[PDB]
A paper describes a structure:
Nuclear receptors (NRs) are ligand-regulated transcription factors that control gene expression in response to binding endogenous metabolites and synthetic ligands, including about 15% of FDA-approved drugs. Peroxisome proliferator-activated receptor gamma (PPARγ) is a lipid-sensing NR and target of antidiabetic drugs that function as pharmacological agonists. A fundamental hypothesis in the NR field posits that in the absence of ligand the LBD exchanges between transcriptionally active and repressive states that can be stabilized upon ligand binding. Inverse agonists stabilize an LBD conformation that promotes interaction with corepressor proteins over coactivators, leading to transcriptional repression of gene expression.
GW9662 is a transcriptionally neutral PPARγ ligand, whereas T0070907 is an inverse agonist that represses PPARγ transcription. To determine if GW9662 and ZINC5672437 can adopt flipped ligand-binding modes, we solved two repressive conformation crystal structures of PPARγ LBD bound to NCoR1 ID2 peptide-bound crystal structures of PPARγ LBD bound to GW9662 or ZINC5672437 each to 1.8 Å resolution. The crystal structures show that all three compounds are capable of adopting the active- and repressive-like ligand conformations. Paramagnetic relaxation enhancement (PRE) NMR studies showed the T0070907- and GW9662-bound PPARγ LBD exchanges between these two conformations. In contrast, in the repressive conformation helix 12 occupies the orthosteric ligand-binding pocket leaving the remaining AF-2 surface regions exposed for binding the longer corepressor peptide motif. Overall, the repressive PPARγ LBD conformation in these structures is highly similar to crystal structures of PPARγ LBD bound to NCoR1 corepressor peptide and T007090724, GW9662, and ZINC5672437 (0.15 Å Cα rmsd).
Numbering used by the authors:
A (entry chain D): 2262 to 2272
B (entry chain B): 203 to 261, 275 to 477
Write the structure that this text describes.
Amino acid sequence: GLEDIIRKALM
Amino acid sequence: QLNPESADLRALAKHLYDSYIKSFPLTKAKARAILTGKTTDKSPFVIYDMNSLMMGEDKKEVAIRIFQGCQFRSVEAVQEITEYAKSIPGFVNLDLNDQVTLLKYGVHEIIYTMLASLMNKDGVLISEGQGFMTREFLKSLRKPFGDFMEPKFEFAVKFNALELDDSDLAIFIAVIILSGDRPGLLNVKPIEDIQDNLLQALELQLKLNHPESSQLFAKLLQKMTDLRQIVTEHVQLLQVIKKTETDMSLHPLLQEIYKDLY
Ligand SMILES: *c1ccc([N+](=O)[O-])cc1C(=O)Nc1ccccc1
């Protein structure tokens, strides 16, 4: 869940 | 001493500070102004016991839902930290997987660094600065809740005694993010190359900003050691919770307050 949030924020 | 290389480090410090201010609306200076009673713009209500808790009404085991809630409320902080990391020269050129790994460990340590700004030896700001939950009231709560926050207060009092400002914290946080010892990192060298430059910028910043503190640079690096242990202590907390046989009911207002913590 956290990794997903970070990946989306890095877009 | 003032030469092209040092000017470049001052320019990096300024770049990071400017990005820090743009990324993080909750700065240390704002928090300390509230804690020292400087802001008369709706001063925070103090919650120090069960009675004042109820007077303060201005807000799937219990502990697990607390953690679910604080992790959800931390999404915005994670997004802010990620935005900040994009401003660190060289970060977005790293392998994407390593960027994710760096942030997935770094965000918790940065959240605790910023939580320290909201803390003094008496308690912690909550409800976006509208409330102040006392340290001893938190510590008095029934197990396992009473042990949740105390190690973070112990850290915060010592950390705050370093008297870092937001200029300092901007670089310190960048150093945290560029930690080359995170598990699962693919290409460690380009990370350490960035961190080494950030460490040079931090060394110079602390010399210029903290004449009173010999070994502040080392003392601050030791704090990175204390931040990791606070994060890893959450694994132990989860085991304590699962083995708790005693009642773990908690007042709904206390659950809501804990969801504002970390
Ligand atoms: C959220 C709210 C309160 C607490 N607490 O009082 O200990 C903890 C959390 C939480 O989930 N913290 C956390 C998450 C992930 C990694 C480290 C710490």
